[PDB]
Design an enzyme around this catalytic site. Structure first.
Site, PDB file in Angstrom:
ATOM      1  N   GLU A  47       3.650  -5.465 -55.181  1.00  0.00           N
ATOM      2  CA  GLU A  47       2.892  -5.625 -53.607  1.00  0.00           C
ATOM      3  C   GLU A  47       1.261  -4.993 -54.330  1.00  0.00           C
ATOM      4  OE1 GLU A  47       4.974  -2.551 -51.699  1.00  0.00           O
ATOM      5  OE2 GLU A  47       4.192  -3.486 -50.000  1.00  0.00           O
ATOM      6  N   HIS A  62      10.499 -12.571 -62.872  1.00  0.00           N
ATOM      7  CA  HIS A  62      11.374 -14.064 -62.588  1.00  0.00           C
ATOM      8  C   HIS A  62      12.327 -14.369 -63.256  1.00  0.00           C
ATOM      9  CE1 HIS A  62       9.999 -18.229 -61.505  1.00  0.00           C
ATOM     10  NE2 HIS A  62      10.515 -18.171 -60.308  1.00  0.00           N
ATOM     11  N   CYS A 126      15.650  -9.273 -60.955  1.00  0.00           N
ATOM     12  CA  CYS A 126      16.235 -10.375 -59.989  1.00  0.00           C
ATOM     13  C   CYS A 126      16.968 -11.146 -61.215  1.00  0.00           C
ATOM     14  CB  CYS A 126      15.420 -10.322 -58.755  1.00  0.00           C
ATOM     15  SG  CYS A 126      14.956  -9.709 -58.040  1.00  0.00           S
TER      16      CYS A 126
HETATM   17  C1  LIG Z   1      14.082 -10.228 -56.703  1.00  0.00           C
HETATM   18  C2  LIG Z   1      13.375 -11.654 -56.663  1.00  0.00           C
HETATM   19  C3  LIG Z   1      12.398 -11.791 -57.693  1.00  0.00           C
HETATM   20  C4  LIG Z   1      11.938 -13.037 -58.565  1.00  0.00           C
HETATM   21  S1  LIG Z   1      12.482 -14.200 -56.848  1.00  0.00           S
HETATM   22  C5  LIG Z   1      13.225 -13.016 -55.674  1.00  0.00           C
HETATM   23  C6  LIG Z   1      13.210  -9.627 -55.816  1.00  0.00           C
HETATM   24  O1  LIG Z   1      11.722  -9.623 -56.232  1.00  0.00           O
HETATM   25  C7  LIG Z   1      11.530  -8.159 -55.314  1.00  0.00           C
HETATM   26  C8  LIG Z   1      10.174  -7.848 -55.687  1.00  0.00           C
HETATM   27  O2  LIG Z   1      10.007  -6.755 -55.925  1.00  0.00           O
HETATM   28  C9  LIG Z   1      12.429  -7.271 -54.157  1.00  0.00           C
HETATM   29  C10 LIG Z   1      13.073  -7.836 -53.787  1.00  0.00           C
HETATM   30  O3  LIG Z   1      13.910  -7.295 -52.550  1.00  0.00           O
HETATM   31  C11 LIG Z   1      14.498  -8.891 -54.420  1.00  0.00           C
HETATM   32  O4  LIG Z   1      15.731 -10.082 -54.044  1.00  0.00           O
END
Ligand SMILES: *[C@H](c1ccsc1)c1oc(CO)cc(=O)c1O
Length: 148
Positions: A47, A62, A126
């Site tokens: 955020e 990412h 992720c």
């Molecule tokens: C996972 C994600 C990272 C890049 S695209 C999707 C993800 O990231 C966040 C942010 O920290 C929160 C989530 O709920 C995700 O699914």
């Protein structure tokens, strides 16, 4: 990077650099509200309400297939004592990967009032793309707390 580490409105410059020798990582962290274009060029915060002076610093990893050698590619080689050096503003913030686990988009109980810690670097990596809906199933979370 400036005096008293904080996040400006410019989403293009670097707030601090993430250095994890254990993961072969020394890359620029982009201060952003996890907006698409922010992640397309690098990593972003979860955020824009958080801050570098805040207790909560959450970096959204990412993960990408196209690129074999980017930031959070080799972060999976990290462990409890990877010595996370966050070069932010001026100072070298060292964090230790003391709290390591992985969650899911259906886990809304981890991103909550997890107070009681010091400056914690929440690495939200992720992994595993679900093509059926377009989400990332495995949200690996490395909570690197500011270590003594
Ligand atoms: C996972 C994600 C990272 C890049 S695209 C999707 C993800 O990231 C966040 C942010 O920290 C929160 C989530 O709920 C995700 O699914």
């Amino acid at each position: 990077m400036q005096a008293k580490p904080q996040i400006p409105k410019d989403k293009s410059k670097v707030a601090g650099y993430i250095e994890i020798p254990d993961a072969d990582i020394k890359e620029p962290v982009y201060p952003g509200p996890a907006t698409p274009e922010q992640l397309n060029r690098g990593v972003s915060f979860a955020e824009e309400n958080e801050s570098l002076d805040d207790q909560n610093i959450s970096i959204a990893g990412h993960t990408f297939i196209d690129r074999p050698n980017y930031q959070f590619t080799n972060l999976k080689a990290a462990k409890k004592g990877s010595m996370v050096y966050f070069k932010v503003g001026n100072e070298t913030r060292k964090y230790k990967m003391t709290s390591i686990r992985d969650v899911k988009p259906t886990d809304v109980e981890v991103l909550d009032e997890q107070k009681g810690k010091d400056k914690q670097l929440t690495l939200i990596t992720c992994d595993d793309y679900n093509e059926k809906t377009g989400v990332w199933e495995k949200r690996k979370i490395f909570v690197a707390t500011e270590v003594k």
